[PDB]
Design a protein around this ligand. Structure first.
Ligand SMILES: [Zn+2]
Ligand SMILES: [Zn+2]
Length: 77
């Protein structure tokens, strides 16, 4: 008993993939944003689509995106 053979070819490289819909992604950011865009309710814990940080709930995310990051309308005031 001793065998071994490989054979897997598929156009398109993506070191990332959604564990919800199996949607491959070539960008770590795109994926994270996809899971929170398509699976915003189908997820308990929330992760920042930018840095590695835990977020209570979606609504909370915004706060972090505004505090830690800069996500707001360009208004003078
Ligand atoms: Zn997905
Ligand atoms: Zn962040």
């Amino acid at each position: 008993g001793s065998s071994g053979s490989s054979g897997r070819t598929h156009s398109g490289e993506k070191p990332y993939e959604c564990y919800i819909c199996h949607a491959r992604f070539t960008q770590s950011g795109t994926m994270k944003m996809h899971i929170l865009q398509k699976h915003t309710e189908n997820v308990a814990k929330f992760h920042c689509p930018h840095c590695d940080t835990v977020i209570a709930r979606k609504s909370d995310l915004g706060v972090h995106l505004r505090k830690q990051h800069s996500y707001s309308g360009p208004s003078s005031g």
